[PDB]
Amino acid sequence: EPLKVEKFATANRGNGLRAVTPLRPGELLFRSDPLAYTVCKGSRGVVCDRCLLGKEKLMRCSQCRVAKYCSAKCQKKAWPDHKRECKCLKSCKPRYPPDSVRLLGRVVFKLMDGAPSESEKLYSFYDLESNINKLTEDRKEGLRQLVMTFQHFMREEIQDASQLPPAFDLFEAFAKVICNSFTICNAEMQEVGVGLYPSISLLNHSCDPNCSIVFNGPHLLLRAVRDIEVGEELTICYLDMLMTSEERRKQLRDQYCFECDCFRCQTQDKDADMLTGDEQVWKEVQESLKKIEELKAHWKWEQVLAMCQAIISSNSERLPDINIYQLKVLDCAMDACINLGLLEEALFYGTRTMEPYRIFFPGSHPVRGVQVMKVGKLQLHQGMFPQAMKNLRLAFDIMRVTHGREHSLIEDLILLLEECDANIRAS
Numbered sequence: 001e002p003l004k005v006e007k008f009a010t011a012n013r014g015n016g017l018r019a020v021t022p023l024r025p026g027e028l029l030f031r032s033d034p035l036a037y038t039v040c041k042g043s044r045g046v047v048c049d050r051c052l053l054g055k056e057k058l059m060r061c062s063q064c065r066v067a068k069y070c071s072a073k074c075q076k077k078a079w080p081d082h083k084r085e086c087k088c089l090k091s092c093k094p095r096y097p098p099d100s101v102r103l104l105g106r107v108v109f110k111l112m113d114g115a116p117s118e119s120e121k122l123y124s125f126y127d128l129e130s131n132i133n134k135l136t137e138d139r140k141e142g143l144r145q146l147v148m149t150f151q152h153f154m155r156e157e158i159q160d161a162s163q164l165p166p167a168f169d170l171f172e173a174f175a176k177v178i179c180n181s182f183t184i185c186n187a188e189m190q191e192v193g194v195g196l197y198p199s200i201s202l203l204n205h206s207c208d209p210n211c212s213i214v215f216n217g218p219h220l221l222l223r224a225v226r227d228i229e230v231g232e233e234l235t236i237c238y239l240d241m242l243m244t245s246e247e248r249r250k251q252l253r254d255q256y257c258f259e260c261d262c263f264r265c266q267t268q269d270k271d272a273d274m275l276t277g278d279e280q281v282w283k284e285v286q287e288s289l290k291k292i293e294e295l296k297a298h299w300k301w302e303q304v305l306a307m308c309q310a311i312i313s314s315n316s317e318r319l320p321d322i323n324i325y326q327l328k329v330l331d332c333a334m335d336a337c338i339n340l341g342l343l344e345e346a347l348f349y350g351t352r353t354m355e356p357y358r359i360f361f362p363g364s365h366p367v368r369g370v371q372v373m374k375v376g377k378l379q380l381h382q383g384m385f386p387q388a389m390k391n392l393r394l395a396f397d398i399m400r401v402t403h404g405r406e407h408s409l410i411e412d413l414i415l416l417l418e419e420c421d422a423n424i425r426a427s
């Protein structure tokens with residue numbers, strides 16, 4: 001087309017994006033590569049720095065030995081955007097910067113040395129919201145420490161303002177990174193990276209959004225997940241869906257500097273179901289999930305499983321599977337079992353998540369699509385063809401909207417549907 005989306009000034013949430021034309025569910029609205037991105041702390045040396053895909057053997061950069069790649073192609077193609085950070089990562093070994101500092105280093109090299117980035121077509125890094133006039137004194141102290149970390153990390157390549165863009169202010173730049181960073185998940189919906197996508201950063205938040213984002217490696221696809229009218233604002237949910245209105249309030253304040261008065265937040269929509277079961281038990285499970293989630297972020301599946309089994313099959317009191325902390329534990333146990341080849345056990349945990357996921361991911365949401373695909377795949381390979389086909393079709397109905405033909409995972413699902421339908425054809 002011309003574009004289906006445009007920048008505008010909203011009445012009370014800054015700049016946003018609105019529909020130029022009526023939009024239908026599954027319609028591709030925009031796509032972008034990042035201005036800058038990096039692998040997250042826990043996936044470092046587990047996934048390729050460039051394509052964010054995993055592999056038993058990664059090859060490191062010989063100069064810094066921090067960057068690791070899946071292939072010669074990826075190591076070579078990454079070199080231009082790695083060249084300057086390489087000198088810094090080496091210089092500062094064995095100190096590894098926070099992900100926000102590595103990210104901002106890549107922003108500064110891209111803006112100093114690169115051609116104008118296609119990622120900034122609708123909105124640039126310069127234009128991003130910083131919320132500087134709402135930052136608490138505590139936040140400002142933490143930004144000051146990031147600035148001093150960046151100055152330390154980058155000293156080999158950046159000694160003064162001459163090597164930053166004109167009137168670039170590192171404090172403001174970090175403030176922009178906090179409230180504009182995208183979390184990059186792999187095809188299995190595991191966090192692997194963080195990136196800046198300035199055009200896409202126009203999207204304001206809704207706890208019941210009309211669009212979704214998905215990632216195919218570092219590439220971001222924005223799709224409609226509802227009917228949208230001409231002039232209607234486009235929204236995504238910035239947060240994990242498995243959060244109460246109080247948890248959403250805390251993160252939207254702390255990270256985004258705004259108060260949400262949507263219907264869901266006004267009515268604590270779903271919070272009572274999410275916290276069913278005995279509070280003493282779900283409080284302990286919430287506490288244990290800090291460690292389980294840290295182990296998962298480091299791809300430590302045997303330790304994830306052990307901790308999850310101690311909860312799911314506890315000798316002591318148990319939670320209903322609609323309890324969000326129980327549900328996260330089931331999720332982590334399912335993924336651990338898939339990665340360990342414990343496929344009967346995986347399917348047990350995955351099937352228990354299906355009804356909670358139907359409730360907590362209403363309409364078309366990519367996380368529920370992928371979860372249903374995983375369960376259907378487990379059923380297909382265990383010879384449960386009618387159960388598998390039902391789940392793979394449901395996954396397709398969701399993923400055709402959330403992922404679309406432009407996402408390679410849809411090709412993988414199409415192959416599973418074909419295999420399943422050959423089996424029912426022969427039956």
Ligand SMILES: C[C@H]1CC(=O)Nc2cc(C(=O)NCCC3CC3)ccc2N1C(=O)N1C[C@H]2C[C@H]2C1
Pocket residue numbers: 179180181182183184185186189190191200201203213214215237238239240366367
């Ligand atoms: C839906 C899925 C889509 C993905 O791949 N990434 C993802 C990104 C965000 C996000 O970036 N929110 C902030 C937007 C910025 C201010 C514009 C939020 C959620 C994300 N997803 C996700 O399920 N999460 C993120 C992480 C694994 C946990 C849960």
Ligand SMILES: C[S@@+](CC[C@H](N)C(=O)[O-])C[C@H]1O[C@@H](n2cnc3c(N)ncnc32)[C@H](O)[C@@H]1O
Pocket residue numbers: 012013014015016127128129131179180201202203204205206255256257258259260
């Ligand atoms: C990723 S940016 C979105 C674009 C931003 N409004 C701009 O002007 O650049 C995130 C910031 O937008 C604002 N924002 C996003 N969703 C909002 C909402 N539902 N209500 C109020 N402000 C919101 C907050 O300032 C938040 O930190």
Ligand SMILES: [Zn+2]
Pocket residue numbers: 048049050051052053069070071074
């Ligand atoms: Zn690669």
Ligand SMILES: [Zn+2]
Pocket residue numbers: 061062063064065066067082086087
């Ligand atoms: Zn290097």
Ligand SMILES: [Zn+2]
Pocket residue numbers: 206207260261262263264265
């Ligand atoms: Zn809300």
